[PDB]
Assembly symmetry: D6
Homo-oligomer: 131 residues x 12
C-alpha cells in the first residue's frame, strides 16, 4: 500500500542478524493503521523466508491468515491473502517433506489452504493442486 | 482504484438525469471485486449528494456504512469510512432540522456516527461536535 | 419461470369473486417446487391488487418478502424481489395516506423497503425516494 | 440462466492450458449477481472435469455445494444442485477407488451426498445407490 | 379423527352448567395421544363459544394455537389450525369491539392471526380481511 | 390419509423399472401438502423394499424419520412413525448379519430405533426386542 | 403429604405471632427433599393468608409458582399448582381492588395466572374468568 | 400414587405372552396425567424384568430415567428415581458381563448412574459401589 | 469471620472525616481472601449508614448484594446476605420517601429485595412486608 | 461450622456397617442449609476413607468438588475446597497405582485437581507435585 | 507510564487550533505500545476539557472507559480508570445541568459511573455522591 | 511495579524449604490489587524454577498465562507476558526432552506458546523457533 516497500529489511537480514531485520520493521514509525501493522508483519514473514527461519515464517503467516479471515480481506485485497495462503502452503509442504509423522497432522491445514487459494483465484491456484 | 476514478459520472448527472448517472455507474462494465462494487456504490452516494436526492444518498450511505462495519473497514481504509460516516451525519442532522419530529428518532444514530468519526480521526471529527 | 403465465386468474377475479380466483390458483396445477409455490403466491398478490383486496395483497406480499429474505433471493432473481418490495411499498404508502395514525408505525417498514429496493437496483428505486 | 451457454470455454481448455480456460471465465464481464458468479463457477468445475484436474473440480464443487446448502438452493433450482452433488459423488468415488486409505474417511461425505441426491430427485438418484 | 364426534357435550352445557360440560370432556375414556388431547381441548373451546364464556374460549384457543405452532400443525392438519386461528380472530374482534382501550394492544395479535390464516388458505382468509 | 392407497405403483416397479415406479409417484402428482408429500415419499420407501434397492429404501426411510422427529409426529399420527422406524430397523438388521463388520458399526442406531419403537407402542415393539 | 398436614402451624399463628408460626415451620425438623421444602413453604403461604400478611403470602406464592414452572409440576402434582395459581390470582385481585394504579401493572400477571389455571383444570378455572 | 397397584399385570405375563401383559397395561382405562403414564411405564419396566426381556426393560428404564432428569424428579419423588437408576445399573452390569466388548462403551453410563444413586441416597447406594 | 470486629472504624468517621474512616478500612493489615474483602466492604457500608452518606451506603450495598448473588452466598452465610438486602431495602424506602418521582423507578428493586429477604428467612422478613 | 463436630459417626462405621454410619448422618438436624448438607456430605466422604469404600469416597468427593465449583467456594472457605481436592487427588493416585490401564484416563482429572490445589494454596500444594 | 508527560500539547491547543493540538498528538511519533495509544488518547480527552470541546471530551472518555472495561483495567492501573470515570461523570453532570430533557436519559449512565468509582476507591468517590 | 523487588524470597528457598519460600510470599503482607497478586504469583513461579520444582513452576505459569489471556495483558505489559510464555515454553521443552511419549501431547501447547511469543515480540521470539 506504501509501507510494503522494504527490500532493505532484506539488506539488514543478510548484513546483521535475522532478529535485527525484524527489530528494524518493529521500530519503523509512525505506525498507526491496522493495515500498516498487517503489511509490516507480512514483510516480517517474507524476510523470514529468505534464510533458515521457516518455522518463524509459518507462525507469522498463520497469524496474518487468521487476521485476514476475521477482517474478510479475501474480498478487499485478495492478492495479499492469496500470497499469505500460498506462502503458508509452500512452507507446510516442505515441513511435511522433512518428516512424514506430521504430514498426517498438516494434511487438513494444507487442504483448507488450497481450497482457500482456489476460492480467491482458481486459475492461479490450479497449478498447486498436484504436489 | 480504478473505479473511484470517474468524475465523468458526475457530468452525466447534470447533462442527463440522476437515474442515467446511476444507470451508467450501474451499467459500467464491469466490477467483480466485493470491494470495487463498494467504491462504485460510494460514487453513487456522492453523485446523489450533487443535486436534491439526499434521502437516496442517506439510504446508499447507510448500506456502505453497514458493510464497512461488518468488514471492519475502519481499520483497513479509515479515510473512506470517515467520509461515509461524516456524509451520513451531515444528511441526518439535516433530516432532523427539515422537521423536528424526526430530530428525536435519529438522535441515537447520529451520536453513534459521531462516536465512530471521533474514533477514526478525533482531530478531524472535533469540528463536527458543535452543529 | 413457466407457471407465471396466468392472466386468466384475473378474469376469474372479475367474472366470479376474489376467493374463486385465489381458490383457482391454489388448486390449479400439479405444483411442487418451492419456486413454483412462491411464484403462484406472487400471482395471488398481483390478482389481489386489481380490485379492493389491498390488505390481502399486503399480507401476501409480506410473506413473499420474508421468504425471499430467508432464501436470500435478492441475489438469485432480484427483479422478482424488487417487484415484491415495490408493490409492498406502494400499498403501504396508500394505507399511510388513508390514516395518519398508522403513518408513524408504518414509517420503519417503508424506510426498510426503500433501503432494500435501493440495494437491489438504485437507478430503478431512485424515483421512489420522493412520495 | 443466460451466462451458462459457454462451450467455447471447453475449447480454450484443449487449445491452450487449463489455467487459460479458467482465467477466460474469471473475466466475463459484466458479472454482478451471486447467481451469475455461482453459474460461472459451475462452468469452471465442469471444465475441470474434462482433462486431468479432478482434485481442482472436487474443490470447486465442494464450494458450490456448500453455497447451495446455505442459500437453500435445493428448493429454488434443484437440477443445478443435483448436478453439483452427483458430480461431487462421482469424483469422490473415483478418488476412493484409487486409494482405499481415504475410502474410509470419504465414506461419510459420500453417504451424505447420496442422501441429498435422493432428497432432490429419488427416481434420478436411485441408479446411484448401488456402487 | 375419532374422539371428535361429541355433540352431546354441547347439550350438557345447556341442561347443566358450563363447568359440567368441560368436566365431562376432561373425564372421557383414558385416551392419551397428544392428538386426542388437543382435539378434546378444541371441543372445550367450541363449547365455550356457545353461551357467554368467550374469555374462556379465547384462553383455550390461544393454548391450542400455541401448541399447533410448536407441533408445526399448519402443514399436517391445516383445516384444524385454520379453524382455531379464525375462531381466535373472531372473538378478539368482539373483545376489541366492546372496549377500544384494548383494541390497540390486540391489534398486533389480530394482524398475526390474519397473516397466519392467509398463509394456510388465502382464498378462505380473503373474506376476513375486511371487518 | 387419502393418497396412500397406491398398490398400482408396486406393479409399475415389476413391469417397468424401479426409476419408472418412483418417477410415477413423483409424477402423479397431483400432490401438494407436506402431509401428502411425506406419505407419497413413504410409498417410495415401501416400493424400494420390493426388489433389490434396500440402500435406497434406507435413505428414503431415514429422511421420513428425520422429518417425523422435527414435526414431532410420534404424538399426532404415531402408527405411521412406528411403521417408518420398524421398516428402518428391519432393513438395518438385514444389513447386519450380512456384512457384520459395520454391523457392530451399526448397532447404536439400531438401538435408537428400538428405543423409539418401544416409546410409541411398547406392546407392538416387545416382539422385536429378541432377534 | 404427609408434610402438608400442619395446622398446628395455624394455631401458633393465632396464639403466638405470625413470625413464630413461620419460625416453627422453618425449623423443619428435618426437611430433606425439595418436595418437603416446597410443601413447607406452601404451608407458610397458607398461614400468611389467615391474618393480615397478604403481601407476604403473595411473595411466598410467587416463589412457589416460579419453582413449579421450572420443576414442570403442572404435570406431576397439578392440584398443588392449581392451588398456588388460584391463591395468587385471588390475592392479586384484592391488591388490584385496593388501588387502581397497580391494576394496570398487575393485569399481565393475572391474565397469565388465569391462562395457567385454565391449562391445569379448565372446568375448575371456568368460574374464575368473570371477576 | 393410584394406578401403580397392579400385580395382576405380572400374572398376565406368565399366563399369556409378554406382549399381552404390556398390551393389557396399555388398556388404560382412564389415563390423563403424565404422572400416571410414567408410573404405568414403570410397571412395564418391572414386568419386563420378570422373564427374559432385559433389553426391553433397559430401553423402558432409559426412557423413564431421561424423563425423570428433564422433570428434575430426583428432588420430588427420589425413591422412584433411585429404583429406576438402580434397575438400569443392574441390567447394564449384566449386558457388560455377557460381552466385555460393550463393557468399555457402557462404563460412562454406569458411572453416571452410580453417581446419581449416591447423590439420591448414599447409604442405600454404598452397597452398589462394589460389583 | 475474624476481621469483622471493627467498631473502632465507626469512631474515626465521627472524630475525623467519613473519607478517613473508609481510607482506614481500605488500609488495615494483609488481607488476602475475597471473604475478608467482602466483609471489610460490609463494614464500609455499615459505617456509611451512621452519618449522612446514604447514597454511598446504597452503592456499597448494591455491590455486595450483586457479588453475593454471583457467589450464591444466600446458601452459605444467609444472615450476611439478609443483612445486606434488608439494609438496602431500608435505605431505598427512605430515598423513596424523600421524592415520589423515583418511588416508581425504585419499586421493582424494592419488591425484588423483599422477595429475596422472604426467600432467606420468611419469619424475619414478615415484619418488613408492611411499610 | 456447627454440625461438623461428629467423630461418633466414625465409631458407628466400625461397630455397625458402613451403610449404618451414612444412614446415621442422613438423619441429623437442623438439616436445611445447603452449607450444613455439604458439610454433612463431607463427613460421609471422610468416613468412606476409613475402611475399604474408596470408590464411594471418590463419588462423594466429586459431587462436593462440583458443588464447590458452582458455588465458587474456593474464594469463601478455601481450606474445605483444598481438603476435598486433595482427598480426591490422593484416592485417584491410589486407583491409578492399582492399575496403569486407567492411569492414562485419570491423568487429565489429576492434573486439573493439582492445578486447583496450587491455585488455592501453592505452598501447601507444592509437596503434592511429586508422587 | 512514559509518553504521558505532555503539557506542551496543552500549549498547542491555546496557540494554534484544537484540531492542531489533537493532530499533534496523533502524530506521535512512532509509538506502537498500545498502552500509549490509550494514554495518548487520554491526553486528547484531557486537552479537550480545557477550552469548550466537552462533547468531544465525552466521546473520547466513553471510548477509553469502554476499552478499560474490556481490558479489565480497574484491576491493573485503577487510578487511570478512576480518572476517566470521574471526568466522564463531571462532564455528564454539566450536560445534565444545561438541559433537563437529557437529564433523564443520562441518569442511568451517571449512576453506573458513580457505582464504578465507588468500586475503585470508595473514600475518593464518597465526595462525588452529592451533586 | 513495587512489590516485585523480592530476591530475599529466593534465599529462603535455598536456606529453608521451597514450601517456606512460597509460604512467605502469600503472607506478603498484604497485597490488595489483582496486579500485585499476579506479580507475587510470578515470583512464586520464578522461585520454583531455581531448584527441582519444575512441574510446580509449570502449573504456576499456566495459571498466570491464562489470567494474562483473560485480562488481555499482551497489550498492556507485554514484557511480563513474554516472560511467562517463554518460561512456560522452556520448561515444557525440558519435560518433552525427558520423555518422548508426552512430546506428541505437549506439541500443540508448545506451538501455541511460540505463536504467542512471536505475536508479542517477533524479533525476541525468532531465536526460540529452532530447538
Amino acid at each position: 500500500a506504501a509501507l510494503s516497500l522494504e527490500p532493505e529489511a532484506l539488506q539488514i537480514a543478510d548484513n546483521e542478524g535475522t532478529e535485527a531485520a525484524l527489530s528494524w520493521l518493529q521500530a519503523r514509525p509512525g505506525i498507526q493503521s491496522d493495515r500498516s501493522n498487517w503489511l509490516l508483519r507480512l514483510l516480517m514473514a517474507r524476510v523470514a523466508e529468505q534464510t533458515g527461519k521457516n518455522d518463524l515464517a509459518l507462525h507469522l503467516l498463520a497469524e496474518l491468515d487468521e487476521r485476514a479471515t476475521r477482517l474478510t480481506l479475501s474480498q478487499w485485497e485478495p492478492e495479499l491473502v492469496f500470497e499469505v495462503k500460498a506462502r503458508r502452503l509452500k512452507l507446510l509442504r516442505m515441513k511435511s517433506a522433512k518428516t512424514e509423522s506430521d504430514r498426517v497432522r498438516l494434511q487438513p491445514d494444507m487442504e483448507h489452504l488450497l481450497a482457500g487459494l482456489i476460492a480467491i483465484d482458481a486459475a492461479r491456484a490450479a497449478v498447486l493442486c498436484n504436489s
